[PDB]
Write an enzyme that holds these catalytic residues in place. Structure first.
Site, short mmCIF file in Angstrom:
data_model
loop_
_atom_site.label_atom_id
_atom_site.label_comp_id
_atom_site.label_asym_id
_atom_site.label_seq_id
_atom_site.Cartn_x
_atom_site.Cartn_y
_atom_site.Cartn_z
N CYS A 1 0.83 -1.19 0.00
CA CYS A 1 0.00 0.00 0.00
C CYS A 1 0.87 1.24 0.00
CB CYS A 1 -0.94 0.05 1.20
SG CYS A 1 -1.98 1.55 1.16
N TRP B 1 -9.30 5.96 -1.36
CA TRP B 1 -9.55 6.58 -2.64
C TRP B 1 -8.49 6.09 -3.60
CZ3 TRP B 1 -8.80 9.51 1.80
CH2 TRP B 1 -7.51 10.02 1.99
N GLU C 1 -3.87 3.60 -10.99
CA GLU C 1 -4.71 2.41 -10.89
C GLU C 1 -5.77 2.40 -11.97
OE1 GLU C 1 -5.69 1.07 -6.75
OE2 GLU C 1 -5.33 3.17 -6.31
N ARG D 1 -0.21 4.60 2.74
CA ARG D 1 -0.21 4.40 4.19
C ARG D 1 0.11 5.65 5.00
NH1 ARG D 1 3.76 -0.41 4.89
NH2 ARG D 1 4.26 0.04 2.68
C1 HEM Z 1 -6.52 6.46 1.49
C2 HEM Z 1 -6.07 6.34 0.23
C3 HEM Z 1 -5.36 5.06 -0.29
C4 HEM Z 1 -4.63 5.02 -1.40
C5 HEM Z 1 -4.33 6.20 -2.36
C6 HEM Z 1 -4.13 3.67 -1.58
C7 HEM Z 1 -3.35 3.26 -2.62
C8 HEM Z 1 -3.05 1.94 -2.89
C9 HEM Z 1 -2.56 1.36 -4.13
C10 HEM Z 1 -2.26 2.10 -5.45
C11 HEM Z 1 -2.40 0.05 -3.91
C12 HEM Z 1 -1.94 -1.01 -4.92
C13 HEM Z 1 -3.27 -1.62 -5.39
C14 HEM Z 1 -3.13 -2.28 -6.73
O1 HEM Z 1 -2.23 -1.88 -7.50
O2 HEM Z 1 -3.92 -3.21 -7.04
C15 HEM Z 1 -2.80 -0.25 -2.56
C16 HEM Z 1 -2.76 -1.50 -1.98
C17 HEM Z 1 -3.25 -1.85 -0.75
N1 HEM Z 1 -3.92 -1.00 0.12
FE1 HEM Z 1 -3.94 0.98 0.04
N2 HEM Z 1 -4.61 2.91 -0.53
C18 HEM Z 1 -5.37 3.73 0.29
C19 HEM Z 1 -6.05 3.32 1.42
C20 HEM Z 1 -6.06 2.07 1.99
C21 HEM Z 1 -6.86 1.62 3.12
C22 HEM Z 1 -7.88 2.50 3.87
C23 HEM Z 1 -6.54 0.34 3.36
C24 HEM Z 1 -7.06 -0.63 4.44
C25 HEM Z 1 -7.63 -0.24 5.59
C26 HEM Z 1 -5.54 -0.05 2.41
C27 HEM Z 1 -4.96 -1.29 2.33
C28 HEM Z 1 -4.27 -1.75 1.23
C29 HEM Z 1 -3.81 -3.09 1.04
C30 HEM Z 1 -4.00 -4.24 2.05
C31 HEM Z 1 -3.19 -3.16 -0.14
C32 HEM Z 1 -2.55 -4.44 -0.74
C33 HEM Z 1 -3.50 -4.99 -1.81
C34 HEM Z 1 -3.05 -6.32 -2.36
O3 HEM Z 1 -2.04 -6.89 -1.85
O4 HEM Z 1 -3.72 -6.81 -3.31
N3 HEM Z 1 -5.29 1.01 1.59
N4 HEM Z 1 -3.20 0.93 -1.97
N1 LIG Z 2 -8.02 -11.98 -9.04
C1 LIG Z 2 -7.02 -12.47 -9.64
N2 LIG Z 2 -5.85 -11.84 -9.64
C2 LIG Z 2 -5.60 -10.74 -8.89
C3 LIG Z 2 -5.94 -9.48 -9.37
C4 LIG Z 2 -5.68 -8.35 -8.60
C5 LIG Z 2 -5.08 -8.47 -7.34
C6 LIG Z 2 -4.79 -7.24 -6.51
C7 LIG Z 2 -6.08 -6.44 -6.35
N3 LIG Z 2 -5.80 -5.17 -5.66
C8 LIG Z 2 -7.05 -4.37 -5.50
C9 LIG Z 2 -6.72 -3.22 -4.58
C10 LIG Z 2 -6.27 -3.55 -3.31
C11 LIG Z 2 -5.95 -2.54 -2.42
C12 LIG Z 2 -6.03 -1.21 -2.82
C13 LIG Z 2 -6.49 -0.86 -4.09
N4 LIG Z 2 -6.59 0.46 -4.45
C14 LIG Z 2 -6.97 1.46 -3.64
N5 LIG Z 2 -6.64 2.64 -3.94
C15 LIG Z 2 -7.73 1.25 -2.37
C16 LIG Z 2 -8.62 0.21 -2.09
C17 LIG Z 2 -9.07 0.37 -0.79
O1 LIG Z 2 -8.47 1.50 -0.25
C18 LIG Z 2 -7.64 2.03 -1.22
C19 LIG Z 2 -6.84 -1.88 -4.98
C20 LIG Z 2 -4.73 -9.74 -6.86
C21 LIG Z 2 -4.99 -10.87 -7.63
C22 LIG Z 2 -7.14 -13.76 -10.37
C23 LIG Z 2 -6.49 -14.94 -10.05
C24 LIG Z 2 -6.87 -15.90 -10.98
O2 LIG Z 2 -7.74 -15.31 -11.87
C25 LIG Z 2 -7.92 -13.99 -11.50
#
Ligand code: HEM
Ligand SMILES: N=C(Nc1ccc(CCNCc2cccc(NC(=N)c3ccoc3)c2)cc1)c1ccoc1
Ligand code: HEM
Ligand SMILES: N=C(Nc1ccc(CCNCc2cccc(NC(=N)c3ccoc3)c2)cc1)c1ccoc1
Ligand SMILES: C[C@H](O)[C@H](O)[C@H]1CNc2nc(N)[nH]c(=O)c2N1
Ligand SMILES: C[C@H](O)[C@H](O)[C@H]1CNc2nc(N)[nH]c(=O)c2N1
Ligand SMILES: [Gd]
Ligand SMILES: [Gd]
Ligand SMILES: [Zn+2]
Lengths: 405, 407
Positions: B111, B283, B288, B114
């Site tokens: 993330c 947000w 993304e 953070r």
């Molecule tokens: C407040 C604005 C926030 C922004 C701009 C942001 C931005 C991002 C971005 C760009 C990613 C990569 C997601 C991707 O490429 O699929 C990410 C991942 C992640 N975010 Fe944040 N985020 C925010 C808030 C939060 C919040 C509120 C939480 C949880 C309480 C959170 C938890 C996570 C987690 C767990 C991931 C890892 C996702 C994964 O491994 O698939 N984020 N965030």
């Molecule tokens: N689902 C499959 N792959 C797959 C695809 C995508 C992922 C990662 C998904 N991240 C979504 C995500 C997670 C956390 C943050 C964001 N963004 C934000 N800004 C955000 C969201 C909440 O607060 C801020 C977006 C992981 C695995 C799959 C596997 C087999 O077939 C299909």
């Protein structure tokens, strides 16, 4: 074996080659250090096992495993190591080993080319003057008036009782960096230290932004000696932009030949601390890193202001727009100058083919994702979506300590 | 030892002493690095182990509030020990839940957002009993978090996993997802990322649309029940039509995205307790949408359409037509969200705030787990400061974890 997925296509492979990794990296199950630039610190029975593995690699590559020739060579190396503590590569082995080291380089995106490498054997070299002769001939050959040819020149291996051959410069062509009294740099900030070393060894410094540095060449047990590259040997490309006519007035240039001169070539337990290698540039190296890194030439904001972009707020993406146009200028300019260059789309596409080739040939391919993915437009290239396994194979190019520290 | 961590733009060195507290193991070994793998292997499915994690978490919490060794600290340890001995599990106080949710976000190595970790609305839905009630909680979450475009970070925590009872699960990967419809020739209409969930919705009685941006219904699973279909009220789902500040034809492309990224398929782990349904929202960072969602070849894959409209030369890679089209799409996303007054952060601002986060965390905890490959944006990587920052990736708890799809 690690399962490796391509997320664009959904294809999956297993990297079985990783099981042959000959050295430890910095990661452990508790924490990954894959993003570190320097992943490491910087005999007879160990030398023999590395020698035998290499000889086995060599004879496998030529489809002569188990031949009388394979067995004779193993025995010969074993007996040479017992009698002398070391051994000598045959010329064909040196060539094979240099190409394998390139093939094995996890951070190199250019490895589709790995089989096409001109190997100059300078293991008979005896002086810094002779090193300069070999280096000048390498540059001439590799430059080839702009039709760049990959090449490596291999100077004598490390051996006990004798100091190393070393090229102190990190590349054969480097622009001077002159530190100013206000902490700023005129020229290339990456080269402040080698610049000061050149001055300390008698070089009369320039004061431009693109002053080509002399070579500091170290023969065994000698202080480094200073050699000026003949300017007609150093092919350079003035940078202009096809539609941004003021861009040429920035006075920017870069050199044709990227020739890395401070890495150690390791083959079969033998170490070649001076083995400079050259290929050609991927345009983002120049246009993105060398010109736009904040700690390099750092031209991004000047270019954006000249493009009439609003640089007061990040969300106009003026940084992105200016960086794209700079990469365009590099590509256009090298093409205009008829100097080989590859854009990051073509390069990463070819690297994907190389991964495919290596999966069939060796069951895997060591690759460093953070270095393979280009520094602009990452996910627009296929390598971004390709999981990679990073591991160390030998023969190898390795970082080594600077010879003045 | 402690990993030495260098910033190559400024030359500053830190030591990550926090990584020595890493709980679970990652996929790397000294023989080979697997840091680039999306799924660092594994997934999801003894009172000693639970009590050990509970105590470490309670100790973490009481340390964070400067009450380690206090009477309240000892009393809480005894309460937890007594609850596990009586019930095999325990209950978080609400203060501990909030702390746990915020730490899990703080600990998320992928993330980049953070810097915001201390500002998180935590809705306690641990009393939830039915899918219908789950839907009410989810709608209230969406309404609060959307806040008419002034997005507020929020998480809603549904009841924890417990022995001999099924999990609450939100089947959708996000609360807002566009349908992906498989065409007869194998292509997809809509979002290819969502073909599987779209077909599951159709299986469970959803009448599909046939557009490129059909908002999917929610499949909500209450313990031991099949998932139940719920239609989001369209006034709950704020969307932004995409236009470009200067490319007047861009609006006619009919591209859109939704305001609220709300991740609904991750497991929240706090002190050994597992919350398989704990959707969180913040947000968007604009890459993304503009780079990944719209330009990935396996997503909407619109890059060449846009390059056609820009009159770019698309049969030579060295024109950088892909790069130019991508930037203008990201410009359109940013312009359009700002015009709609919907919170969004560009990748320069986000990565600059993440550097500030790394600085705060070095002083606060002696380090910060970060996944370089995910923190560095998918365009203009080295134009952002995080590219030049070495990072150490490791697993701390509380955590958000991947978990297997419920079907
Ligand atoms: C407040 C604005 C926030 C922004 C701009 C942001 C931005 C991002 C971005 C760009 C990613 C990569 C997601 C991707 O490429 O699929 C990410 C991942 C992640 N975010 Fe944040 N985020 C925010 C808030 C939060 C919040 C509120 C939480 C949880 C309480 C959170 C938890 C996570 C987690 C767990 C991931 C890892 C996702 C994964 O491994 O698939 N984020 N965030
Ligand atoms: N689902 C499959 N792959 C797959 C695809 C995508 C992922 C990662 C998904 N991240 C979504 C995500 C997670 C956390 C943050 C964001 N963004 C934000 N800004 C955000 C969201 C909440 O607060 C801020 C977006 C992981 C695995 C799959 C596997 C087999 O077939 C299909
Ligand atoms: C022929 C065209 C080639 C291209 C386009 C190419 C491209 C690249 C690029 C872009 C990098 C990353 C460099 C950086 O960011 O600093 C790299 C690294 C590397 N290349 Fe290649 N290369 C080529 C040829 C070669 C050759 C001929 C060799 C050796 C025989 C080689 C060995 C290496 C090694 C060892 C690295 C890692 C350097 C490091 O870790 O600092 N490459 N290459
Ligand atoms: N060494 C320091 N940092 C540092 C800085 C940069 C690097 C990266 C070095 N890669 C140069 C390089 C290497 C390999 C290939 C290329 N490109 C090519 N196309 C190419 C060159 C030859 O064939 C193809 C370019 C490594 C270390 C340091 C520390 C203190 O001061 C200075
Ligand atoms: C900290 C980070 O590892 C560092 O900036 C790396 C990232 N990836 C890179 N990739 C390439 N090709 N060259 C580099 O110098 C770097 N630098
Ligand atoms: C294979 C590779 O790990 C994969 O494409 C990663 C790279 N970095 C990423 N970074 C972010 N933020 N999101 C992603 O989905 C990915 N994908
Ligand atoms: Gd012009
Ligand atoms: Gd037209
Ligand atoms: Zn690793």
């Amino acid at each position: 074996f690690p399962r490796v997925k391509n997320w664009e296509v959904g294809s999956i492979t297993y990297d079985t080659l990783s099981a042959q990794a000959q050295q430890d990296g910095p990661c452990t199950p508790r924490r990954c250090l894959g993003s570190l630039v320097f992943p490491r610190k910087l005999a007879p029975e160990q030398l023999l096992s590395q020698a035998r593995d290499f000889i086995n690699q060599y004879y496998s590559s030529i489809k002569r495993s188990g031949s009388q020739a394979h067995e004779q060579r193993l025995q010969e190396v074993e007996a040479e190591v017992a009698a002398t503590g070391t051994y000598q590569l045959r010329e064909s082995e040196l060539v094979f080993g240099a190409k394998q080291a390139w093939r094995n380089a996890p951070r190199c995106v250019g490895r589709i080319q790995w089989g096409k490498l001109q190997v100059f054997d300078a293991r008979d070299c005896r002086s810094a003057q002779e090193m300069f002769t070999y280096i000048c001939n390498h540059i001439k050959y590799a430059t080839n008036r702009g039709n760049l040819r990959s090449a490596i020149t291999v100077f004598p291996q490390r051996c006990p009782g004798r100091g190393d051959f070393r090229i102190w410069n990190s590349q054969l062509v480097r622009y001077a960096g002159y530190r100013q009294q206000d902490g700023s740099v005129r020229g290339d900030p990456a080269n402040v230290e080698i610049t000061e070393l050149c001055i300390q060894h008698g070089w009369t410094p320039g004061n431009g932004r693109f002053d080509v540095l002399p070579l500091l060449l170290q023969a065994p047990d000698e202080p480094p000696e200073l050699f000026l590259l003949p300017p007609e040997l150093v092919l350079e490309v003035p940078l202009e932009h096809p539609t941004l006519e003021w861009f040429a007035a920035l006075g920017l240039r870069w050199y044709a030949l990227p020739a890395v001169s401070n890495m150690l070539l390791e083959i079969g337990g033998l170490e070649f601390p001076a083995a400079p290698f050259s290929g050609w540039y991927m345009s983002t190296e120049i246009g993105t890193r060398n010109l736009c890194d904040p700690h390099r030439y750092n031209i991004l904001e000047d270019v954006a202001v000249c493009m009439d972009l609003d640089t007061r707020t990040t969300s106009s993406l003026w940084k992105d727009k200016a960086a794209v146009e700079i990469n365009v200028a590099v590509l256009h300019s090298y093409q205009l100058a008829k100097v080989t260059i590859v854009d990051h789309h073509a390069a990463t596409a070819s690297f994907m083919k190389h991964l495919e080739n290596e999966q069939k040939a060796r069951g895997g391919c060591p690759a460093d994702w953070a270095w393979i993915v280009p520094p602009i437009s990452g996910s627009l290239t296929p390598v971004f979506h390709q999981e990679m396994v990073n591991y160390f194979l030998s023969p190898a190019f390795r970082y080594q300590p600077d010879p003045w520290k």
